[PDB]
Amino acid sequence: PSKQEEEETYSYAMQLASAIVFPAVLQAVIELDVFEIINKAGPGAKLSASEIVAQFPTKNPEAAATMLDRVLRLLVSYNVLYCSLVAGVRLYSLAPVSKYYVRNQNGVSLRPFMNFHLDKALMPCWFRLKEQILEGGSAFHKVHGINFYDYLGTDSRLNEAFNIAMFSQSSIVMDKIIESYKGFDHVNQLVEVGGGLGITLSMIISKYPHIKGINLELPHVIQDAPSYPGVKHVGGDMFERIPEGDTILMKWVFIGFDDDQCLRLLRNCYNALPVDGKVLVIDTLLPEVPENSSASRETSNMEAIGLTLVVQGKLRTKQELKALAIEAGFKTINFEYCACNLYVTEFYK
Amino acid sequence: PSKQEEEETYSYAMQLASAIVFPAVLQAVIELDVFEIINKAGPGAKLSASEIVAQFPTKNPEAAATMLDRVLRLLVSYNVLYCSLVAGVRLYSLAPVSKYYVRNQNGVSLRPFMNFHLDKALMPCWFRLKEQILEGGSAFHKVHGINFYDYLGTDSRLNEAFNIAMFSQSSIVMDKIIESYKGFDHVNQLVEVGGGLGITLSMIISKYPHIKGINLELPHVIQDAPSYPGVKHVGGDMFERIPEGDTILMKWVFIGFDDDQCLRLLRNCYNALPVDGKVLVIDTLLPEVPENSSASRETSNMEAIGLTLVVQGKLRTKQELKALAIEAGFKTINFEYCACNLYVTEFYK
Numbered sequence: 278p279s280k281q282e283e284e285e286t287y288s289y290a291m292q293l294a295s296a297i298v299f300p301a302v303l304q305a306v307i308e309l310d311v312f313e314i315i316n317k318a319g320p321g322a323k324l325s326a327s328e329i330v331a332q333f334p335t336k337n338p339e340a341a342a343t344m345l346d347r348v349l350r351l352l353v354s355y356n357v358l359y360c361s362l363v364a365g366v367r368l369y370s371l372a373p374v375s376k377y378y379v380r381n382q383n384g385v386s387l388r389p390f391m392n393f394h395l396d397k398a399l400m401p402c403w404f405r406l407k408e409q410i411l412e413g414g415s416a417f418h419k420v421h422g423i424n425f426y427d428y429l430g431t432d433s434r435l436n437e438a439f440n441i442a443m444f445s446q447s448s449i450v451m452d453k454i455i456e457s458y459k460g461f462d463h464v465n466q467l468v469e470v471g472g473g474l475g476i477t478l479s480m481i482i483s484k485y486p487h488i489k490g491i492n493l494e495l496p497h498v499i500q501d502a503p504s505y506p507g508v509k510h511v512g513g514d515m516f517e518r519i520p521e522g523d524t525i526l527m528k529w530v531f532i533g534f535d536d537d538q539c540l541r542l543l544r545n546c547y548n549a550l551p552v553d554g555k556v557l558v559i560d561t562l563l564p565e566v567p568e569n570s571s572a573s574r575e576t577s578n579m580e581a582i583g584l585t586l587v588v589q590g591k592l593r594t595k596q597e598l599k600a601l602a603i604e605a606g607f608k609t610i611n612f613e614y615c616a617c618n619l620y621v622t623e624f625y626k
Numbered sequence: 627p628s629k630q631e632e633e634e635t636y637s638y639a640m641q642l643a644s645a646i647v648f649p650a651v652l653q654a655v656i657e658l659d660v661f662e663i664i665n666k667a668g669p670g671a672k673l674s675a676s677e678i679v680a681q682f683p684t685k686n687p688e689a690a691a692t693m694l695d696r697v698l699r700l701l702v703s704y705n706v707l708y709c710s711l712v713a714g715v716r717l718y719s720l721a722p723v724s725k726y727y728v729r730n731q732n733g734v735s736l737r738p739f740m741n742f743h744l745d746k747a748l749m750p751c752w753f754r755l756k757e758q759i760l761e762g763g764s765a766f767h768k769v770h771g772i773n774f775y776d777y778l779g780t781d782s783r784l785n786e787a788f789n790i791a792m793f794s795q796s797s798i799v800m801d802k803i804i805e806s807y808k809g810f811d812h813v814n815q816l817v818e819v820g821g822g823l824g825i826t827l828s829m830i831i832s833k834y835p836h837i838k839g840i841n842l843e844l845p846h847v848i849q850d851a852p853s854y855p856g857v858k859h860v861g862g863d864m865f866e867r868i869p870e871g872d873t874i875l876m877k878w879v880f881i882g883f884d885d886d887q888c889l890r891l892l893r894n895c896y897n898a899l900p901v902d903g904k905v906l907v908i909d910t911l912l913p914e915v916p917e918n919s920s921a922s923r924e925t926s927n928m929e930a931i932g933l934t935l936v937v938q939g940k941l942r943t944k945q946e947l948k949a950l951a952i953e954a955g956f957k958t959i960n961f962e963y964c965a966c967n968l969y970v971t972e973f974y975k
């Protein structure tokens with residue numbers, strides 16, 4: 278239908294045939310510090326490819342500038358950069374989505390998050406999904422012979438790379454969640470299970486300094502975590518024991534586990550909480566239907582990552598989460614959307 | 627910047643951090659024959675993930691259908707498939723773009739074209755663009771110590787993969803080009819340089835049976851080329867000599883060469899043509915501005931594949947092609963948009 282629409286469909290089909298190049302181009306530009314260079318130049322700066330290349334460690338800036346101008350035009354057509362023309366020369370500025378890959382005040386961005394999925398330890402795993410669907414099991418396990426968190430405890434390089442990737446995504450999002458979710462008035466001893474390096478707790482204690490915090494984590498994660506104020510790092514296993522407190526918190530944890538792991542975990546929360554304790558679960562809820570939206574696209578990608586790394590896991594619906602709580606001991610359950618495609622799921626005991 | 631805009635920007639930024647999973651997923655689904663399976667069922671058919679897995683060699687259809695429903699939800703988010711909910715069951719149908727990856731009457735689709743970009747010899751090349759922007763040169767040459775087309779004369783597996791990739795793409799578009807471009811009246815002897823396996827000449831000769839056709843091409847390409855009536859496969863080199871004809875044809879050839887190579891090539895064309903000869907160059911022109919369109923994303927994807935495989939090449943504007951015509955001796959130049967993001971540039975002698 279329609280010649281305009283039929284041409285758009287042909288081009289999208291061609292776009293899909295070579296969509297492997299977009300991650301490769303995005304990573305190369307980002308890791309050439311191009312977004313840092315445009316950003317440092319000042320608020321709303323517009324820099325030519327020749328200007329940007331002046332700051333590269335290159336012995337042939339002529340070739341680099343002609344090469345770079347091609348991939349910067351690519352990022353413009355994918356809405357990552359803006360373009361302005363001054364005498365037939367193209368001047369590029371940061372578009373909204375690029376600011377998530379510019380280092381902020383502390384030097385944090387989504388860069389180590391994107392670079393984790395492009396790691397040499399993970400790249401061959403994405404492309405064994407056909408074998409995984411047909412033969413069951415896990416792509417990550419097919420490639421490495423050990424499951425995901427188990428493998429991390431054997432490779433410090435990838436453990437560290439994963440940890441910075443979680444750390445970076447957490448810092449970027451918790452500022453918007455903390456501003457959305459006003460539910461720490463009745464928190465005094467917060468316990469975060471599978472909290473990574475510790476930044477989620479630290480940022481809650483920074484806005485709510487009455488809170489003391491415990492970070493329950495596997496020991497290979499907490500090995501050299503920073504010594505945040507009011508944060509105690511505890512090395513154990515949330516399927517064995519959870520330290521005692523009045524509130525338990527879980528971000529990007531519940532989605533990694535099957536129903537039987539999830540119930541053993543919520544019963545350990547129940548036993549660690551007091552008669553009025555509560556559990557907080559920060560996660561995306563499973564959408565009832567996929568759709569053509571970047572939220573839906575973000576969610577599906579996460580689903581695909583989960584399939585590849587921890588097949589056991591799943592994104593769950595409201596009804597799936599409520600029933601898991603009730604069987605574990607909890608009485609009340611609430612769902613509060615807290616921005617960034619994320620909910621806070623409250624299991625009141 | 628509304629809160630909806632700020633939310634869409636975050637979700638896009640998250641989509642970009644994991645954009646490597648989309649090629650992996652589109653490939654795994656295409657190679658499980660899912661687009662064939664839904665297509666067999668009839669125009670507009672909506673199948674459940676369990677119906678689809680009925681035709682897999684899986685040995686565990688239940689795990690297969692769980693896993694497959696996650697990746698099919700992904701393709702619905704990226705507008706490759708449709709999803710309809712019936713009695714709480716998700717039924718998937720083919721969206722217009724997926725039709726390009728369903729084998730047609732002759733068994734051709736963009737499947738081997740996409741699969742070429744995911745080849746084990748091309749994959750390490752895409753993710754070296756930072757190293758090649760800094761040091762100049764070709765990522766392909768850096769990975770495979772020979773330039774692109776010369777390596778093809780050394781790797782019979784990759785030669786076939788590539789030749790089929792070009793065969794598939796030209797079959798798709800050549801029907802629409804011929805339908806839009808009536809500039810083949812008058813032509814008697816058509817010489818096509820870099821014609822590949824020859825399906826594009828064959829197709830022209832099928833609607834214009836009067837035309838005789840020469841397919842000047844590298845020996846390792848025409849070695850096992852098909853035999854089309856009215857098409858003579860000539861092993862050679864367009865930079866040494868182009869056989870005489872009243873019309874010369876180039877598709878996806880010119881963009882692979884720097885300005886000096888194009889002048890030598892156009893000189894050879896000028897000397898092979900009669901007083902009223904003409905050269906036809908089928909190629910995407912360089913757009914003056916990148917835009918947010920699948921057209922411009924397709925164009926940019928190609929510019930980046932160019933950087934990775936043959937750095938010296940370039941897409942060119944009308945003024946740049948005009949200047950190369952004049953320098954080579956041609957009298958008139960014309961530009962006619964055909965279809966499929968392609969132009970015919972006519973060099974008139």
Ligand SMILES: C[S@@+](CC[C@H](N)C(=O)[O-])C[C@H]1O[C@@H](n2cnc3c(N)ncnc32)[C@H](O)[C@@H]1O
Nearest residue numbers: 443447471472473494495513514515516528529
């Ligand atoms: C994907 S991460 C989430 C990290 C952090 N919550 C965030 O959102 O950035 C899941 C974390 O849970 C931790 N984890 C997994 N199993 C665990 C267990 N049995 N006991 C303690 N921690 C565990 C992992 O080490 C990992 O860092």
Ligand SMILES: C[S@@+](CC[C@H](N)C(=O)[O-])C[C@H]1O[C@@H](n2cnc3c(N)ncnc32)[C@H](O)[C@@H]1O
Nearest residue numbers: 792796820821822842843844862863864877878
């Ligand atoms: C990308 S392809 C285009 C194939 C075909 N025109 C199409 O569009 O499907 C470029 C072709 O030009 C051929 N080629 C490259 N250099 C050549 C030369 N010096 N003489 C003849 N053919 C050449 C290559 O073998 C390759 O098949």
Ligand SMILES: COc1cc2c(cc1O)[C@H](Cc1ccc(O)cc1)NCC2
Nearest residue numbers: 529530532533579580582583586587590
């Ligand atoms: C979006 O990027 C990641 C997100 C997460 C992880 C890894 C990533 O690369 C790991 C494994 C996992 C991923 C997805 C899923 O559905 C379940 C578990 N844990 C939690 C979320």
Ligand SMILES: COc1cc2c(cc1O)[C@H](Cc1ccc(O)cc1)NCC2
Nearest residue numbers: 878879881882928929931932935936939
């Ligand atoms: C879209 O996919 C391909 C298109 C083409 C080729 C390889 C691909 O993978 C080869 C190398 C090349 C690619 C791009 C470019 O700008 C110049 C040369 N020749 C012509 C067109």
